[PDB]
Amino acid sequence: KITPVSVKKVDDKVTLYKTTATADSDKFKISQILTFNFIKDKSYDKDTLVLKAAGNINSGYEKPNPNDYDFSKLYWGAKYNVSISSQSNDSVNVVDYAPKNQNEEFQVQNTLGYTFGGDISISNGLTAFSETINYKQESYRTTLSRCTNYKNVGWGVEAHKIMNNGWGPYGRDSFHPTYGNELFLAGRAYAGQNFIAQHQMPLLSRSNFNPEFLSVLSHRQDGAKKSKITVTYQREMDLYQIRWNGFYWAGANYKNFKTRTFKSTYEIDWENHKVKLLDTKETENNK
Amino acid sequence: AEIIKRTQDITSKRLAICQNIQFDFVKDKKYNKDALVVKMQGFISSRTTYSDLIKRMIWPFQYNISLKTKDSNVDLINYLPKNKIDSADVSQKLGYNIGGNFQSAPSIGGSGSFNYSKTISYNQKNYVTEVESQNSKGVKWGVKANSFVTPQVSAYDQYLFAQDPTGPAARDYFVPDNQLPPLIQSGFNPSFITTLSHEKGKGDKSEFEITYGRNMDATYAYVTRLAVDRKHDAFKNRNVTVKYEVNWKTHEVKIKSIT
């Protein structure tokens, strides 16, 4: 689903065209809610698109059977990747975005502002147009992809310091020589009842991530009127296992044992400030 | 005839390189073999640094991409680009028709219609592409510095990029950003294809390697008048190799290692 364009004349010189497009994968429990803000600026001969990427990405977590006796496992949402990408020989660049710096605050919050004549400023916290991002990521860290460039921006939102009661912090690769990975281990019952209480797991590991990310695409008004972009939401599911060995409970964490990847493709009509869904692509890996 | 699509995304943090690969299985009853069309994308950072030892600019002379196998299970049957090409815009297309018929075109526009197709597109301004080796077991491309536009200069000019120093800092001994092309200032977005064929029933699994990286040169400027030297192949083969296992029977592609 795609809203019609709504139009806000900010003054004689700036018009905003907004459309919100929604693309869902019911199979993966991912829902992309994209808000496209075209900024028409009569003093600047580039189109500006502020694209806000929101919605939700299910963690992939399911509660274990409480009757698992000697051995039990859970999958959890250990990393979320978002990318917004342009094409190599179109004349559209990714010129700015938010967030930009590595960030482990409980809430990521940024404000983007567009200044008349075409300048973008990004600041911390909640100009002719403004937009904000705000997302909770407790126990996770957001890192800008090292492969961000003029055709592509990406972020990884990844398990960083997970506290287990007053124990930890644990991560995806924690290893104790005896207990293995203790991330979600209650006590060193049935295996199925020896994971820590769900409410003590980070919300991103057991429920949904609600991403909010901004990017700024600049389009030259010479050459083509239309271009394509893609937006990818992805989860890495880690397999977290607990096992009685004879003497004690030990845990093991296998990174990215399942991957789920939803890519949508949109045609951008820069002359008319409209977008059209061209494609959705669900891929999965299962180690 | 159907297409089973997979992807693999892997990042080397050390090298600042991303392999975003697409793996498309062509499953065709009118066709003797399995085919896997592999599209290689992602990003290889330029890793252009300006330091003191005398300022040094280290910079990517060549980008490397290759796919190789050691198995007798599997052969490469096509690759794109197929031939040397020097235009800034490289846009090409592979096509497949029912019956085991692959053709390619050196363009996207005007390239005809197929049951299935896959395109490549990349920009390589001031660079040129060479297909340094194709055999039935591997292919290697190099995207090599060629010639630069100045306020026009070969990639082998020793004084390339050096500047009467605009300041005391190392970066001030080398031309500004708006004078460097994306492949120096930012990096390379690769877009390459190779098809893997496997005689149906001749083994369930096969293995192959994809490598991305770069060869760095080094330019050295200082005022003694500006003097400028140049080390070609300063740091060669700054590369990441990713080994994949393909399962023909279940149409799956797994990562085995990243070096």
XYZ file of C-alpha atoms in Angstrom, chain A residues 17-187:
171
model
C 5.639 16.189 -1.437
C 5.091 13.313 0.936
C 4.160 9.706 0.180
C 4.242 6.698 2.580
C 4.769 3.269 1.037
C 4.316 -0.012 2.965
C 5.851 -3.324 1.875
C 5.300 -6.422 4.055
C 6.602 -9.985 4.220
C 4.082 -12.057 6.119
C 6.394 -15.096 5.766
C 9.283 -13.263 7.580
C 7.223 -10.874 9.754
C 8.874 -7.842 8.356
C 7.100 -4.740 7.459
C 8.828 -1.797 5.731
C 7.141 1.569 6.294
C 8.864 4.081 4.041
C 8.086 7.791 4.041
C 9.304 9.629 0.991
C 9.681 13.414 1.387
C 10.526 15.184 -1.878
C 11.766 18.671 -1.400
C 11.193 21.026 -4.351
C 13.417 24.032 -3.874
C 13.167 26.851 -6.419
C 16.789 28.028 -5.739
C 18.390 24.596 -6.284
C 18.389 22.466 -9.400
C 18.697 19.069 -7.725
C 15.783 17.046 -6.472
C 16.076 16.088 -2.823
C 14.495 13.013 -1.355
C 14.504 12.500 2.401
C 13.602 8.868 2.818
C 12.623 7.648 6.221
C 12.814 3.867 6.732
C 10.586 2.494 9.582
C 8.223 -0.352 10.334
C 9.372 -3.470 12.137
C 11.617 -6.561 11.823
C 10.538 -9.550 13.941
C 13.489 -11.097 15.886
C 12.684 -14.579 14.723
C 12.511 -15.749 18.373
C 10.061 -18.580 19.410
C 9.731 -19.791 23.016
C 11.320 -23.148 23.620
C 9.188 -26.249 24.545
C 9.266 -26.310 28.421
C 9.443 -30.167 28.144
C 12.814 -30.193 26.366
C 14.712 -32.362 28.826
C 18.475 -32.655 28.276
C 18.898 -30.224 25.430
C 16.953 -27.221 24.221
C 17.522 -24.298 21.881
C 16.103 -20.915 20.983
C 16.724 -18.603 17.906
C 17.070 -14.926 18.702
C 17.413 -11.630 16.720
C 21.059 -10.973 17.193
C 21.590 -8.506 14.359
C 19.459 -6.260 12.138
C 20.733 -4.813 8.900
C 19.064 -2.019 6.952
C 20.329 -0.690 3.524
C 19.045 1.838 1.133
C 20.612 1.701 -2.199
C 20.714 3.607 -5.480
C 22.006 2.391 -8.881
C 25.550 2.722 -10.347
C 24.951 4.768 -13.463
C 21.772 6.624 -12.566
C 22.414 10.223 -11.476
C 21.214 9.819 -7.908
C 23.501 9.920 -4.915
C 23.124 9.122 -1.300
C 24.468 12.438 0.072
C 23.555 12.234 3.797
C 21.872 10.003 6.369
C 21.139 9.370 10.064
C 22.446 8.107 12.296
C 26.071 8.579 11.333
C 28.131 7.759 14.380
C 28.485 4.485 16.192
C 25.862 4.623 18.922
C 25.131 2.472 21.988
C 22.652 4.683 23.755
C 19.445 3.021 24.789
C 17.531 5.223 22.379
C 18.957 6.496 19.147
C 17.624 9.995 18.410
C 18.538 12.371 15.578
C 17.033 15.376 13.842
C 17.599 16.126 10.167
C 16.964 19.599 8.725
C 16.961 20.828 5.138
C 18.043 24.423 4.582
C 16.828 26.525 1.603
C 19.454 26.274 -1.142
C 20.051 22.569 -0.459
C 22.153 22.071 2.764
C 21.421 19.224 5.195
C 22.277 19.260 8.812
C 22.044 16.212 11.138
C 21.987 16.705 14.861
C 21.563 14.620 18.105
C 18.237 14.805 19.786
C 14.685 15.245 18.807
C 15.388 25.154 8.104
C 12.509 24.527 5.616
C 11.839 20.827 6.409
C 12.618 18.698 9.440
C 12.579 15.011 10.187
C 13.417 12.869 13.142
C 14.430 9.403 13.939
C 13.809 7.664 17.250
C 14.375 4.026 18.114
C 15.046 1.951 21.244
C 17.947 -0.554 21.042
C 18.741 -1.457 24.680
C 21.759 -3.794 24.932
C 22.459 -3.282 21.161
C 24.801 -1.041 19.281
C 24.197 0.679 15.895
C 27.110 0.879 13.533
C 27.191 2.546 10.097
C 28.275 0.117 7.436
C 31.988 0.478 6.426
C 30.693 -0.037 2.823
C 28.519 3.122 2.771
C 29.325 5.209 -0.333
C 27.506 7.418 -2.861
C 25.153 4.684 -4.096
C 24.424 2.911 -0.806
C 23.911 3.379 2.876
C 23.663 0.630 5.527
C 23.447 0.139 9.280
C 24.007 -2.893 11.536
C 22.086 -3.015 14.846
C 23.841 -5.704 16.826
C 23.862 -7.482 20.194
C 26.508 -5.620 22.206
C 26.288 -5.950 26.007
C 23.684 -8.185 27.360
C 23.351 -8.407 31.128
C 22.108 -11.602 32.713
C 20.837 -10.628 36.164
C 23.853 -8.772 37.461
C 25.977 -11.046 35.283
C 27.781 -10.117 32.134
C 27.920 -8.296 29.884
C 27.535 -11.190 27.358
C 27.659 -11.075 23.540
C 27.344 -13.276 20.445
C 30.847 -14.723 20.944
C 31.135 -14.967 24.743
C 32.929 -18.139 25.874
C 33.627 -19.386 29.359
C 35.925 -22.500 29.292
C 33.453 -24.352 31.457
C 29.948 -22.855 30.893
C 30.366 -21.914 27.215
C 28.099 -19.013 26.240
C 26.015 -17.877 29.200
C 23.922 -15.223 27.420
C 20.489 -16.757 28.133
C 21.373 -19.534 30.642
C 19.338 -19.391 33.899
C 21.427 -21.674 36.146
